[PDB]
Design goal:
The chain is an all-alpha fold. It has one domain (1-25). The chain contains one helix and no strands. The protein starts with 17 loop residues before the first helix and ends with a helix.
Length: 25
Amino acid sequence: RLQQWRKAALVLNASRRFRYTLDLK
């Protein structure tokens, strides 16, 4: 199923480093 398929590699990868860049503030 598309669920957790294309997103599991989108938000878990692309944004995988969003917590650091966001906390850097």
